[PDB]
Design a protein around this ligand. Structure first.
Ligand SMILES: Nc1ncnc2c1ncn2[C@@H]1O[C@H](COP(=O)(O)OP(=O)(O)OP(=O)(O)O)[C@@H](O)[C@H]1O
Ligand SMILES: Nc1ncnc2c1ncn2[C@@H]1O[C@H](COP(=O)(O)OP(=O)(O)OP(=O)(O)O)[C@@H](O)[C@H]1O
Ligand SMILES: [Mg+2]
Ligand SMILES: [Mg+2]
Length: 1355
């Protein structure tokens, strides 16, 4: 090796020894270092074995022949030079390793081999170099090399084709080149360019990325962690679950780092070249191939990080779902629904963000410590000053990082609260609007959001300070280093060969703050998720659930408690129910009857006892849980359809007439929460679902409380009673009605939480006890609309909405600071680059401009972020207004997964992602403008080609967004259902656990997450594909310029026209990518604004048509016809009703279940707009009155008692306009004073999510108490005495008559004994007033009211 023949001569020729040693050691060596490592992948990852094909054999045979040929050389050498022995033998054995490797790759099922192809490419290049040398030299050993080269070339061509396999994702069958360049998606790219992409065009998820192949692994690792603990560290299972695949990104990152620092070296040598021409010709090809390899390796790395992050999100969502399924009630109360929604919606987004920066945590300092080494051999140990200054920032910024962490914690917590509150608003929206409480809860959510945004603003301030100090650190590194060095000297050369590296070193310092912020957010997320996954899970084992002694349900001294901290609810429970025995659990409000049933379901923590429940359990919750599936799928509940039994169950449960009056019968969609159905129909559907599932034990909790006497008797005789379908099954019937007690085989009285009395009706009527006194006293359609993805470019109105929310001043402040920051850098660059009194009057200028840059970097960092606070403060508020203003029909048709999506994930994207992405987009755009100015001032003749360079880039940008947006849109549209499922799963956890349908719901959640990732994975693959092409465009303008600067070296600066072209292509690549990122992120604002155009309710307050202050003073409600139609696709439910309710008239709207009684109440409050007719209350038409002017003047006690999570006093009046003394009085007339007073927290008692902390009787009492609090001249009593005992029932009626004595009251009830005291009643059968007079007159008429009183036992 000497420079005369290798570099100095115009003939590019290697030396003979170099040819025979290094050129042969390179490829053989590559396979030797990779071979061992490759067994790891070949072993850990398997896909079967490929069959015997001609291609595989062709490759194997050529591997055998190639080895022979190489050993044939050793034979001829055996037949002086030392290299003529070792080299042929080494090549033969590495060749024997190559053929063995394709053999084992066949065995392990790999169609395209990256190793073989790259290995053959390197061998080919080495052979090409020797080939050219051997053909320039000119039989004996040359012909062996020609045979070797031809065989190697054919082997390389063969290695490109993909072998046979052992809406599929093309990656599973793509060739090696297709996957290294992400070509397997280009088909969807052009498709997505001709028509908008839909979910149908999207490919099915890869097997490795599928939820049921990812979540289980994480669950198993977590279970192994917990076993070791008996705290379990979530981080341990994380890398024990995601490192085996992620660690290859370390190799890709290292290779990319090495080659990205090697590239500029080649650039500098090339621009120094403009040294025989060949030198530059080689220089440009080497630079081109190194750049292309850099892009490919960096981009496969990015893909690995993104796929690992997506798998992390899938695993986190699945684990959260499973834990929520197995969670206990105490932990479920502790970890609110908002917290679970945050964990599964944006907590894994933090991990996804981390996945891109967890590889930079070691790369940044690697480049840093190298630059110090480059600077060292450049200058000397004076850098001790520089390293110290850089080190000083680490703790200083870490201190702030710690502070930021706290903020994030608080922030995350505030977020949970907000989401939890929103969930309550979604669940009790009908009650919220009926009570005119939309404004109060809007203000509550606004206060929570303001607190969360203040915390986020402080966190953004600290992040801006950290970014500022990190950006000013390198300027200090230099300033301090030169400062100590002067006290050799700083020759313009030595001094400035150090400044260039300082700029190179400032890259990691600029990227660090992002890494720190992502790590802090991911650490907070890990903490929240580890705390959740470590929550106590209820033990089913506690209830010996023996399969089918004959004592179906036996209990021995059970002390069940809802939580360990709280006192036990069940005190010494002990009873034994024989098989097939009808059991009624009677009692007053809040005595643990539903607690007893949930204790038999293992939903209650057992302090001590022995409970054995034998046989399958079928449970019906007092509040019926209904999913979005139709009635047939609700009754089936994932069961095989048997028409003979399904029809019998439907007919027996008195559900047939309701199906007759339903539009599509039993196939019509039923709504997210059963809001389509009535209370009685909901209860009947839940009971029929339990009955159809043939179980051995049926725990019925008030299944006939919301149905009339006739339908209740029909159901009991045909389903529950001794002559019903359930006659052979043990049945625990928790009921308050005592009409069916004589039929009961065993009656258990639950008083104070314990078994006060046990026996039959005839046994308890002779004991002469408390229950004896109680008995003596006798007192398809497709309703839901799924999320829709917009088809087209996002409207510029969305960008305007995000800009006008930020504000004019903040927007220009930010644009001006961006422009100033990038101008300052360009001045600093021009002051150093071209202009390279120097000491003190030039290096200082570099520091001065540099500091002037950092402050501006700080400036917009504090200007965009606060803008992100402003817009998120507006975008949410309008949304919070827009959602509430929407009518009840909107919440009916829109599932509670779109509304949660806007408030959880799209809002999060608006909060944090969009401001940062806007910041980076503005930075890239101004960088491109600055580069355009730079290359315009220098060589203005080149300005002709500047627009074309941009034009082509523009086209690529367009060609990409037309697909990319849709993918993002589809991702959001594919994410809305998942939330819904969680909500549904969170609403009916007890039902799912009791029916043992946990596995089916787990599979449904896996399917929904699989759809979401089917939408999301093509998005990241699209980013990679676009990026490869964009960077390749640059590398093919760098090489092309590098070519045109070496073709014009002695002709009319060319060398700076490459280093200009490359920088302009880079800036352009970043610009096209960041514009695509901003365009995709604006989809979040476009989904938030989607609800703005949604039709909403009538104006809340009509100023002109305001009623008098004392408007309902008479309360003379007068319907004219008031036809009611929920949607303009169904039949009327209030066809031509004419009532003339007088002032202060006790009127009772009684009728059969599902007749339209509560539709009257919904129409009185204008909740559902009238189809034909009007209501003139006190000579004032409500159609004309303002919405609040109507709803604030009329009280209602809703059928479904919903208590929003929070303080009990907050539930009684969220407006907080009643004094605590008055609220105490209102609780006293509700017969709840004792219960609230024995509570440890008194009125500040925290109600659970949806009020589950209280019994439904106590929730009805709370509704009555808040009705007493309002107490206007119109009271609507929508079945208030529906799930309360007879003693409480009469107490409620007594106080109602007492307090509501001079106000018009419209009472809908199935208990006719509460309506006989009413002056007149309204009888409803099919939305028609059949009988309209006094109850005595109707009884004389012997009509339908008489019959209803007959089934009620009142005659
Ligand atoms: N939110 C709703 N949207 C559309 N239709 C509904 C809704 N709620 C009930 N319906 C339907 O309207 C009809 C009357 O319902 P409504 O609840 O007014 O009857 P009801 O006799 O008062 O019932 P219940 O006895 O259970 O209180 C039924 O066909 C019912 O399924
Ligand atoms: N999830 C819960 N956590 C804690 N306490 C609860 C919970 N659910 C109910 N309770 C309380 O436990 C007691 C008994 O509740 P339970 O619903 O079993 O009573 P009940 O007599 O069956 O009610 P109802 O008369 O309304 O049918 C009440 O004080 C109630 O507020
Ligand atoms: Mg109950
Ligand atoms: Mg009703």
């Amino acid at each position: 090796w000497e420079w005369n023949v290798t570099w100095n001569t115009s003939n590019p020729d290697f030396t003979k020894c170099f040819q025979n040693t290094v050129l042969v050691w390179v490829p053989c060596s590559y396979l030797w270092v990779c071979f061992p490592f490759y067994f790891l992948y070949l072993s850990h990852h398997d896909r079967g074995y490929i069959q015997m094909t001609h291609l595989n054999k062709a490759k194997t045979a050529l591997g055998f022949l190639l080895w022979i040929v190489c050993w044939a050389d050793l034979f001829y050498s055996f037949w002086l030079a030392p290299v003529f022995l070792v080299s042929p033998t080494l090549l033969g054995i590495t060749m024997l390793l190559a053929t063995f490797l394709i053999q084992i790759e066949r065995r392990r099922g790999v169609q395209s081999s990256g190793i073989m192809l790259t290995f053959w490419l390197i061998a080919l290049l080495c052979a090409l170099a020797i080939l050219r040398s051997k053909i320039m030299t000119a039989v004996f050993r040359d012909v062996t090399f020609y045979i070797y080269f031809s065989l190697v070339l054919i082997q390389l061509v063969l290695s490109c084709f993909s072998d046979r396999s052992p809406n599929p994702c093309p990656e599973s069958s793509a060739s090696f080149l297709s996957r290294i360049t992400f070509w397997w998606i280009t088909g969807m790219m052009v498709q997505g360019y001709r028509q908008p992409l839909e979910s149908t065009d999207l490919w099915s998820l890869n097997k490795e990325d599928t939820s049921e192949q990812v979540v289980p692994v994480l669950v198993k690792n977590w279970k192994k962690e917990c076993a070791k603990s008996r705290d379990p560290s979530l981080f341990k299972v994380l890398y024990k679950t995601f490192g085996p695949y992620f660690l290859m990104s370390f190799l890709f990152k290292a290779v990319h780092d090495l080659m990205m620092f090697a590239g500029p070296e080649i650039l500098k040598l090339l621009i120094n070249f403009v040294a025989p021409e060949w030198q530059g010709y080689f220089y440009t090809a080497l630079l081109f191939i190194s750049a292309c390899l850099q892009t490919l390796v960096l981009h496969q790395y990015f893909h690995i990080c993104f796929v690992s992050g997506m798998r992390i999100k899938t695993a986190v969502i699945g684990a959260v779902y499973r834990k929520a399924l197995v969670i206990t009630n105490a932990a479920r109360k502790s970890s609110t629904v908002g917290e679970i929604v945050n964990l599964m919606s944006v907590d894994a987004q933090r991990f996804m963000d981390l996945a891109t920066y967890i590889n930079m945590i070691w790369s940044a300092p690697l480049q840093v410590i190298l630059a110090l080494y480059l600077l060292w051999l450049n200058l000397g140990p004076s850098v001790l000053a520089g390293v110290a200054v850089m080190v000083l920032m680490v703790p200083l910024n870490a201190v702030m990082a710690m502070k930021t962490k706290t903020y994030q914690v608080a922030h995350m917590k505030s977020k949970d609260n907000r989401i939890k509150l929103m969930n309550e608003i979604l669940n009790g929206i009908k009650v919220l609007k009926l009570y005119a409480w939309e404004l109060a809860f809007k203000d509550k959510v606004l206060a929570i959001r303001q607190e969360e945004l203040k915390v986020l603003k402080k966190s953004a301030y600290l992040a801006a300070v950290g970014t500022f100090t990190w950006v000013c650190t390198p300027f200090l590194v230099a300033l301090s280093t030169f400062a100590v060095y002067v006290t050799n000297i700083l020759d313009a050369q030595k001094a400035f060969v150090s400044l260039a590296l300082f700029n190179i070193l400032r890259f990691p310092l600029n990227i660090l703050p992002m890494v720190i912020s992502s790590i802090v957010q991911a650490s907070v997320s890990l903490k929240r998720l580890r705390v959740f996954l470590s929550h106590e899970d209820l033990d089913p084992d506690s209830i010996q659930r023996r399969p089918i002694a004959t004592n179906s349900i036996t209990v021995k001294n059970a002390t069940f408690t809802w939580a360990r901290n709280d006192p036990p609810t069940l005190h010494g429970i002990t009873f034994s129910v024989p098989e097939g025995s009808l059991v009624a659990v009677v009692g007053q409000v809040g005595c643990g009857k539903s607690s007893l049933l949930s204790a038999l379901l293992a939903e209650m923590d057992k302090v001590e006892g022995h409970v054995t429940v034998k046989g399958s359990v079928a449970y019906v919750p007092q509040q019926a849980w209904i999913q979005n599936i139709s009635l047939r799928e609700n009754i089936l509940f994932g069961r095989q359809l048997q028409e003979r039994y399904y029809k019998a169950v439907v007919e027996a449960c008195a559900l047939l007439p309701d199906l007759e009056i339903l539009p599509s019968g039993d196939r019509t969609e039923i709504g997210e929460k059963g809001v389509n159905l009535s209370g009685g129909q909901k209860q009947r559907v839940s009971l029929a679902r339990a009955v159809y599932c043939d179980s051995d034990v049926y725990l019925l909790d008030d299944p006939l409380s919301a149905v009339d006497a006739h339908v209740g008797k029909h159901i009991f005789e045909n389903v529950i009673g001794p002559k019903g379908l359930l006659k052979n099954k043990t049945r625990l019937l928790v009921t308050h009605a005592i009409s069916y007690l004589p039929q009961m085989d065993v009656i258990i009285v639950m008083s104070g939480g314990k078994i006060s009395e046990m026996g039959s009706y005839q046994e308890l009527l002779a004991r002469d006890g408390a229950f004896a006194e109680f008995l003596r006293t006798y007192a398809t359609w497709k309703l839901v609309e799924a999320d829709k993805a917009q088809t087209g470019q996002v409207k510029l109105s969305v960008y305007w909405d995000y800009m006008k929310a930020i504000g004019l001043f903040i927007s220009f402040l930010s644009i001006f600071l961006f422009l100033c920051n990038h101008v300052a850098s360009l001045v600093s660059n021009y002051w150093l680059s071209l202009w390279t009194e120097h000491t003190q009057v030039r290096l200082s200028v570099y520091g001065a401009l540099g500091i002037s840059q950092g402050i501006t970097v700080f400036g917009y960092s504090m200007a965009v972020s606060i803008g992100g606070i402003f817009a998120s403060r507006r975008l949410h508020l309008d949304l919070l207004h827009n959602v509430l203003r929407s009518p009840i029909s909107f919440f009916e048709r829109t599932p509670s997964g779109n509304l949660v999506n806007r408030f959880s994930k799209e809002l999060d994207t608006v909060d944090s992602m969009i401001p940062q992405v806007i910041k980076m987009f503005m930075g890239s755009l101004f960088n491109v403008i600055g580069a355009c100015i730079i290359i315009l001032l220098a060589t203005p003749m080149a300005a002709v080609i500047i627009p074309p360079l941009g034009l082509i880039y523009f086209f690529v940008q367009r060609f990409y967004v037309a697909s990319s947006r849709q993918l993002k849109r589809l991702e959001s549209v594919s994410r809305s259902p998942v939330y819904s499922h969680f909500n549904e799963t969170l609403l009916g956890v007890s039902v799912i656990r009791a029916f043992e349908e946990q596995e089916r719901f787990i599979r449904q959640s896996d399917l929904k997450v699989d759809e979401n990732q089917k939408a999301y994975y093509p998005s990241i693959v699209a980013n990679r594909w676009l990026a490869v092409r964009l960077e390749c465009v640059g590398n093919c303008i760098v090489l092309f310029a590098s070519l045109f600067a070496v073709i014009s070296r002695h002709s009319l600066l060319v060398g700076l026209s490459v280093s200009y072209s490359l920088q302009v292509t880079t800036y352009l690549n970043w610009l096209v990518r960041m514009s695509s990122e901003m365009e995709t992120n604006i989809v979040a604002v476009e989904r938030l604004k989607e609800y703005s155009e949604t039709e909403k309710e009538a104006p809340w307050q009509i100023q002109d048509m305001a009623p008098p202050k004392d408007w309902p003073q008479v309360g003379r409600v007068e319907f004219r016809d008031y036809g009611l139609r929920y949607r303009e696709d169904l039949d009327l439910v209030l066809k031509h009703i004419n009532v003339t309710i007088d002032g202060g008239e006790k009127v009772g709207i009684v009728g059969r279940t599902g007749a339209g009684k509560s539709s009257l109440t919904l129409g009185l409050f204008r909740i559902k707009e009238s189809a034909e007719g009007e209501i003139i209350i006190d000579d004032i038409n409500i159609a004309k009155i303002g919405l609040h002017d109507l709803r604030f003047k009329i009280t209602i006690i809703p059928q479904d008692p919903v208590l929003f999570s929070g303080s009990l006093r907050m539930n009684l009046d969220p407006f907080s306009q009643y004094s605590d003394e008055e609220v105490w009085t209102s609780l006293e007339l509700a017969h709840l004073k004792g219960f609230v007073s024995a509570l440890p927290d008194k009125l500040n008692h925290e109600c659970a999510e949806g009020g589950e902390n209280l019994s439904v009787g106590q929730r009805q009492l709370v509704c009555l108490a808040r009705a007493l609090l309002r107490k206007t001249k119109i009271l609507v009593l929508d079945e208030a005495t529906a799930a309360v005992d007879l003693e409480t029932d009469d107490l409620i009626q007594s106080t109602i008559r007492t307090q509501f004595d001079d106000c018009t009251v419209l009472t809908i009830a199935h208990r006719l004994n509460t309506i006989m005291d009413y002056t007149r009643v309204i009888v409803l059968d099919k939305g028609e007033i059949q009988e309209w007079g006094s109850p005595s007159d109707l009884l004389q008429q012997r009509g339908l009211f008489y019959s209803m009183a007959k089934d009620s036992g009142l005659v």
